[PDB]
Structures are given as structure tokens and as C-alpha cells.
From a paper:
The pivotal roles played by Mpros in controlling viral replication and transcription through extensive processing of replicase polyproteins, together with the absence of closely related cellular homologues, identify the Mpro as a potentially important target for antiviral drug design. The substrate-binding pockets located in a cleft between domains I and II, and especially the S4, S2, and S1 are highly conserved among CoV Mpros suggesting the possibility for wide-spectrum inhibitor design targeting this region in the Mpros of all CoVs.
We were able to solve a 2.7-Å resolution crystal structure of SARS-CoV Mpro complexed with I2 despite the weak noncovalent binding, in order to enhance the inhibitory effect of these compounds. Briefly, compound I2 binds to the shallow cleft formed by a portion of the strand eII and a segment of the loop linking domains II and III. The Cβ atom of the Michael acceptor forms a covalent bond with Sγ of 145-Cys as expected. However, the failure of P2 and P4 to be properly accommodated by their corresponding subsites attracted our attention, and might account for the poor inhibitory effect of this series of molecules. First, although phenyl at P2 could enter the S2 site, its rigidity prevents it from reorienting to insert further into this site. For the P2 subsite, the phenyl group was substituted by a more flexible Leu side chain.
Residue numbers in the entry:
A (entry chain B): 1 to 302
B (entry chain A): 3 to 303
The structure:
């Protein structure tokens, strides 16, 4: 019952947040075992951000060029390397609080928790989704960089995102724990259109099923709609095209609630076209798409 | 600008599973004490209206099974404090963070670490609604889940989950076992009073917008706290009081926009809607960001 944009317990991720400083640049880092990840752009001098040559800027650095700090104790960096847009600083001590973890490049539309950090210190956690344009509509300020995006599968933390940029659109862009950006962005402060955004159709349906699982039903109709017709409409409303895989995914949620995916699609279509009569769905006044089908099934069943 | 929750690390280390017979729920393990809903000592038979006092006096420490991981905390004492059970355990939680028990006030917010069988499952931010309930997300077995605020390094435990009003909302108690609202921890037929918009927070929010550069809604005029309330009344807004105004002060000072001025702005935001316009991204007027919260996210904490 009830429905919140729920984030995973950030506890296990906090125990891996550290401060990493190079020159006068300081940002967050992930310290797992004997390694610390952070946006390689930490080595970027001010003026060096217009068009930095990381390979060049890094070679001019050394282990001691990095001031990695765990809380208030200085971590000794005894090895460093670059992996795409990351810095993999090896340290001498191994973080005893390193949770069971895995690095995963999430798929646009998927959701994850973000531990907003500043100076290697957890400031807040929020759940967000990998927007369709690969950016993340988040709340980040200067110094949030190095914050990690993660998921928790029981006790195994899946790091999927590491903050890096701030597209002018006000959104945010980062990398996966392997340094590869999400979207067509780069470690440069150079014009970067935060690509055409779309509404995650998959999630809005998952969300609508959630509202239904929770008793709300007013938006349903006797109408139905082919996958193709739903798309012809949805796309007009700037919605991600809905694929058969998506409806397969909504399968479970379809069963429970007993509503056929396209029927729900028929409801979504109506909503899009008739607006919400001012009325609300599961609280919101606008179709929510930051809850994946998996999220919903996890927050409604048990 | 998203609704952020305090990192739940500290509370996570204080969540334990409390079992009593067939009833299992979450327990807050601070020091040598484990707090959990007193209805942990219930079951299908004694719920409509259990006599806890009696029901507990029939239970002994061996009745309770407090667990943390694959560890079992021998319970060496048990007392009931209002609607909570204070369970003394033979072990003082090593992860106990500096903590206070503070009874939150309507409108104020806090993070909620939703738990299941002693395990933290998810953490979200919410507000203690005017009607005294919370638009949270809880499923069976979430009981004992705690709400909290973090002041520097101190955890301010302000909420513990117990009931779920038919409204789809939730009632709980502070960590002293006293319920927030008229609600009780019984299967009565209690209903949440109608809710209102936390005017104070909407305001705080608008300010936050102004702080981030979203000020299209401001206006040249002002209004009287009285005149504003006549509007707010229509849109079912909490009547703004001078105490509310003073609470906004910092935000008001930072942006130099007088509360009554911002109300004037909110007045027209209510009477003319946002005409397709968005404040801080949203299309609706957020009322779950207290003045203090607005600071947190904007003035990094
Ligand atoms: C994190 C940097 C950090 O922690 O530094 C501490 C000293 C950010 C966070 C960014 C701040 C506000 N919200 C955010 O998400 N890192 C940056 O400031 C980066 N800045 C940008 O992304 C800029 N992007 C940009 O110029 O792109 C175009 C507008 C040209 C398309 C923003 C601020 C305009 C950053 C980039 C590169 C290196 C270091 C930092
Ligand atoms: C936590 C109990 C727990 O941990 O039990 C583990 C076995 C809840 C959480 C509740 C679950 C779903 N969302 C929630 O908020 N404890 C209860 O189930 C309690 N149930 C209620 O509060 C019921 N309220 C109720 O009937 O109120 C009226 C409709 C009569 C006004 C809900 C579920 C309808 C609960 C029941 C009995 C004693 C103590 C708590």
C-alpha cells in the first residue's frame, strides 16, 4: 500500500565513500577492497577542463599526487591507472566495509539509488532512473562528483553509475563503474546537448499497474489497443516506443491485477490524450515513469 | 530537485528482526535496548483490541527472539512503553550511532528506512502530514520500520511504523511509543482526518526554487497572512501562521523575499495555476520540503 519513490538502503555504499583530492580538486570516490574509483577529471586543472588530455594530464601525476581520504584518515594511494573516464587508485588498506559488489552498466529506463556525496561524505540518497537520453534527472551540486549510482540485490551492491557532469539542461551525466559514460558525453566542459528525452513507457505502465495493485482503478477503460496503435499515440506524446519485450516484462504485473498489458496501454493512451481530468493517480498529477516494473513488483507484492 | 533521504547507513545498523511467537517485525536496536511495536506480542486472535498490558505480562524474555544477521540477541529484559516494547538485550549494539528520540511535528519531514524481517529494504523521504499520518509505502512485515532525521552525525529517531489507515496512509508513534495523531495500535475503525497542503513547506519549496533560479512566479506585490489564508483555505492549504513565517526566515533572508511576498506569489500560483509552467521541474506545488530541508539540498550538507 502507499507508493514512494523508494531508494535502496545506502548503508553499504556509504562505507565505500571517500574523498579523493588531486591538486586543488576534490570529489568523491568509491573504495572497494584496495581500490578507489573516481572521475578521472579530478586530475583536471581548472583551465584544463576546456579540452583536457587525460593520458597526458595523468602521466604527469603520481601515486602521491592523489589525496584519498577515508573519513578523516588519509588513505595511502600506492598505484593508479585510468580506465576510460575513471581513475582506479590502488591503496594500501582494504576497506573492511566493502560490501559484496558487482559493477553493472544499466540500461536506459532502469532505476537505481544515488548516494549524493560531498567530500567523500554521504549527504543524501534518492532513487532515480537512467533517463532515456542517458542523463539522470537528479539533485547534484558542485562537489557531488564521484557520487555513485547503485542497486542492491539482497546484499550484493550493483554499482551502475558514477557522477561526472551537469548538462546545461539541468540534468546530470555520469559513467558506469568502468568509466564509460552513459549517453554521448565526455569528460570535457564543451557544449553537450542532453539528448532528446522521452518518457519511459515501460515504467509508466509499471506505475499504473502499481496504482491498480494498490486499489486505484479509475484510469482503466474497456478500450484496448494494438501495440502499434498505442505507440502511434505514445510517440506523439513523446513516450519511448513500447516493444513486445516491454509487455513481456509487464507480464507478472499483468497477471497480478489481471489486466492485459495492451489494455493498460489502452488506459495509458486515454490518459495521455484526455489528461488526468486534474485527478490524480497514486498521488501524482502526472504519469510517473521512474519506477521500473521490477521496482513496482518489489514495492507492492511483499 | 528530488526528495532526498538521509543516508540510511546509521539506522541500517540499528535494524533488527523481532520475533514473538508467530509475529515477526523490525526492531530498532539502540544500545542494550531493542524498540519495536508492542503489537509484536499479538496474532490473529488478539488484534481487534488486544490488552497489551495483560498480553505482555504473560510473555517472558524467552518469548522474544531479537535477531541481527545470523546472530540472536538474548533478550534479558522487557517492558512496554506506551505502544512500544523496550527489550533489554544482553548486547549493546556496536553500530549504535549518536541518537535522539524526537517527536516530529506535523509538516516536518524525515527519512523512513522501510524494513522487513529485520532487514532494511528501501529508504524514502516523507512528511508527517497535517492529519498526522504519512504518505509512506509499507507492506506487511514493515512494522518497526523507523523514520529519522540526521543532524550532523546524530540520528533523530522520530518515527516507528505501526498502523496503515484504510486511506492507504500510515500511522506510527515516536520512539516513546506515543502515537502521532488520534490513532491507536488496534484493529478499530479509525480514519485519518482529511489532509491539507503543508503551506509552510510549499513556501519553503518556492524559496528553494528562487534559490535555484526559478523565480518566474514571484510578483511585485505582497499580501497579509490573513488574506493569504483566505485563498489557501480554498485550495485546502494549512493556514500559514506567524510561527510558520518565522520558520521561513532563513530562506526569506537568503533570497530577501518576505514570506508574505512569497505568499502573494503562491496566492497567484494557486488562483492561476502554473499555466504549463514548472517550478523546480515539478508541475505541482511540493509540500514535503520543510524550510530546513530546502537548506540541506541547496546548501550542501
Ligand atoms: C562534479 C565536480 C566535483 O565534484 O568537483 C569538485 C571540485 C560536477 C557536478 C555538477 C555540479 C552541478 N551539478 C552537477 O551535476 N562536476 C562538474 O562541475 C562538471 N561540470 C559540468 O558538467 C558542466 N558541464 C558542461 O559545461 O557541459 C556543457 C554545458 C558545455 C554541455 C556544467 C557545470 C555546466 C565537471 C566537468 C568536467 C570536469 C569536472 C567537473
Ligand atoms: C506492521 C505489522 C507487522 O510488522 O506485522 C508483522 C507480522 C503493519 C504494517 C501495515 C502493513 C501494510 N501497511 C502497513 O502500514 N502492522 C499491521 O498490519 C497493522 N495493521 C493495520 O494497521 C490495519 N489497520 C486497520 O485495520 O485500521 C482500520 C482499517 C480498522 C482503521 C491495516 C493493515 C488495514 C496492525 C494490526 C494490528 C495490530 C497492530 C498493527
Amino acid at each position: 500500500s502507499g507508493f514512494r519513490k523508494m531508494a535502496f538502503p545506502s548503508g553499504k555504499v556509504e562505507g565505500c565513500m571517500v574523498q579523493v583530492t588531486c591538486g586543488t580538486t576534490t570529489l568523491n570516490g568509491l573504495w572497494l577492497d584496495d581500490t578507489v574509483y573516481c572521475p578521472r577529471h579530478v586530475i583536471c586543472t581548472a583551465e584544463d577542463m576546456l579540452n583536457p588530455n587525460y593520458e597526458d594530464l595523468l602521466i604527469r601525476k603520481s601515486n602521491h599526487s592523489f589525496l584519498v581520504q577515508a573519513g578523516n584518515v588519509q588513505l595511502r594511494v600506492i598505484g593508479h591507472s585510468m580506465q576510460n573516464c575513471l581513475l582506479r587508485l590502488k591503496v594500501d588498506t582494504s576497506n573492511p566495509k566493502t560490501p559484496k559488489y558487482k559493477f553493472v552498466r544499466i540500461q536506459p529506463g532502469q532505476t537505481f539509488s544515488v548516494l549524493a556525496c560531498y567530500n567523500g561524505s554521504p549527504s543524501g540518497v534518492y532513487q532515480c532512473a537512467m533517463r532515456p537520453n542517458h542523463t539522470i534527472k537528479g539533485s547534484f551540486l558542485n562537489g557531488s562528483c564521484g557520487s555513485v549510482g547503485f542497486n542492491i540485490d539482497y546484499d550484493c551492491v550493483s554499482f551502475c553509475y558514477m557522477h561526472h557532469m551537469e548538462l546545461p539542461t539541468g540534468v546530470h551525466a555520469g559513467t558506469d563503474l568502468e568509466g564509460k559514460f552513459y549517453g554521448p558525453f565526455v569528460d570535457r566542459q564543451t557544449a553537450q546537448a542532453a539528448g532528446t528525452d522521452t518518457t519511459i513507457t515501460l515504467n509508466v505502465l509499471a506505475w499504473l499497474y502499481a496504482a491498480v495493485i494498490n486499489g486505484d482503478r479509475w484510469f482503466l477503460n474497456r478500450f484496448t489497443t494494438t501495440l502499434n496503435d498505442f505507440n502511434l499515440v505514445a510517440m506523439k506524446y513523446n513516450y519511448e516506443p513500447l516493444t513486445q519485450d516491454h509487455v513481456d516484462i509487464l507480464g507478472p504485473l499483468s497477471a497480478q491485477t489481471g489486466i492485459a498489458v495492451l489494455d493498460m496501454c489502452a488506459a495509458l493512451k486515454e490518459l495521455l490524450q484526455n489528461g488526468m481530468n486534474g485527478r490524480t493517480i497514486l498521488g501524482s498529477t502526472i504519469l510517473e515513469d521512474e519506477f521500473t516494473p521490477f521496482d513496482v513488483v518489489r514495492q507492492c507484492s511483499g
